[PDB]
Paper text:
The Salmonella T3SS effector protein SopA is a HECT-like E3 ligase that promotes Salmonella infection-induced inflammation. Lacking noticeable primary sequence homology to eukaryotic HECT enzymes, the crystal structure of SopA showed the characteristic bi-lobal architecture of HECT ligases. Here, using quantitative proteomics, structural and biochemical analysis we elucidate how Salmonella HECT-like ligase SopA specifically targets and inhibits human TRIM56 and TRIM65.
To circumvent this problem, we fused the minimal binding regions of TRIM56 (1–94) and SopA (163–425) using a flexible linker. The interface of SopA and TRIM56 contains a mix of hydrophobic/hydrophilic interactions with a buried surface area of 750 Å2. In TRIM56, residues Leu25 and Glu26 contribute majorly towards interaction with SopA. Although, the first Zn2+-binding loop of all the aligned RING domains fits into the cavity between the β-helix domain and the N-lobe of SopA without sterical clashes, the central α-helix of various RING domains appears to be clashing with SopA and rendering the binding unfavourable. Hence, positioning of the central α-helix of RING domains relative to the first Zn2+-binding loop is one of the crucial factors defining the specificity of SopA.
Numbering used by the authors:
A (entry chain A): 167 to 428
B (entry chain B): 18 to 78
Write the structure that this text describes.
């Protein structure tokens, strides 16, 4: 298999045997160094695998693979390895990742993605994810002295546990909107994404939020800019565990006041 | 695929520079200091007298 079409068919044959079809040999399950660029998975595969409580893609290895401009939405992966792969510009609308490894991955998917990706019992170690995701169920581990993946454009990086998050270059209208306004964008924001974590990782959330605010202090901000996201900021920050954060509190204070004048 | 690499969200009123990378319009306007502007991806570029100028890339969709 030297091209995506071959890899598609190879999976498409291998996935089908996992109908199932039980059980599959390890060697045939490995898709190391695969290539799935520009592939739309539904067209090749059944709606069972791609909807509701249907079929599961279990026990695979997609290490060092390349999902780029591919569409992977609504699928469910379990016991899978995506280590070192690039999922940049993928379309993973409401894609589920269970008991999986997605460490050292590029997950800054394309905006086209409608529904937040969901990760459960999954690791995003040193994985740069887009700030709009569902991390309820994610496993976190101690951050190494690693470095953010080299990317073009955007701003500086903050750590969410051991996950990488990239701030915008400048806090502009759309920057503020997409990052903070989850009300206009129906539940999607970096606020919701940080808070999405399980209550277990309370401290990680706060440092992430604190770091997020630290970047918001730096930008020369204006009421006018924050006006459309006052409600959004408050809905998440005005509650624990972000009320026990002096940094967040003293910054949220004035913003919280104007909001209440309505 | 593409989004303003200042705001990192889908483009609004896209304006393409003469090197040529596309971004939101205000994203150019706010980024401009001392008039001049630079592509974040590579390097410097000319400023136009008012902003809200320079080719509006193909709009979709
Ligand atoms: Zn922009
Ligand atoms: Zn450029």
């Amino acid at each position: 298999p030297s091209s995506p079409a071959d890899w598609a068919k190879k999976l498409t044959d291998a996935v089908l045997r996992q109908k199932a079809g039980e059980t599959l040999t390890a060697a045939d399950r490995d898709f190391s160094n695969a290539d799935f660029r520009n592939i739309t998975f539904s067209k090749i595969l059944p709606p069972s695998f791609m909807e509701r409580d249907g079929d599961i893609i279990k026990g695979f290895n997609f290490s060092n693979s390349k999902f780029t401009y591919s569409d992977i939405s609504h699928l469910h992966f379990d016991e899978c390895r995506f280590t070192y792969s690039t999922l940049s510009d993928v379309v993973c609308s409401n894609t589920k990742f269970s008991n999986s490894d997605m460490n050292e991955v590029f997950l800054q998917y394309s905006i086209t993605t409608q529904q937040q990706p969901s990760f459960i019992d999954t690791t995003l170690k040193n994985t740069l994810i887009r700030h709009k995701a569902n991390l309820s169920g994610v496993i976190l581990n101690e951050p190494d002295n690693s470095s953010p993946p080299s990317v073009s454009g955007g701003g500086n990086f903050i750590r969410l546990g051991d996950i990488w998050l990239q701030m915008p270059l400048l806090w502009t209208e759309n920057a503020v909107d997409g990052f903070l306004n989850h009300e206009h964008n129906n539940g999607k924001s970096i606020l919701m994404t940080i808070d999405s974590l399980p209550d277990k990782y309370s401290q990680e959330k706060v440092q992430a939020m604190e770091d997020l605010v630290k970047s918001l202090r730096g930008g020369r901000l204006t009421e006018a800019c924050i006006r459309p996201v006052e409600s959004s900021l408050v809905s998440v920050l005005a509650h624990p565990p972000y009320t026990q954060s002096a940094l967040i509190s003293e910054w949220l204070g004035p913003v919280q006041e104007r909001f209440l004048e309505a | 695929f593409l989004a303003c690499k200042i705001c990192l969200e889908q483009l609004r009123a896209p304006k393409t520079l003469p090197c040529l990378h596309t971004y939101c319009q205000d994203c150019l306007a706010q980024l401009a200091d001392g008039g001049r502007v630079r592509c974040p991806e590579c390097r410097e570029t000319v400023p136009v007298p008012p902003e809200g100028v320079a080719s509006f890339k193909t709009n979709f969709f």
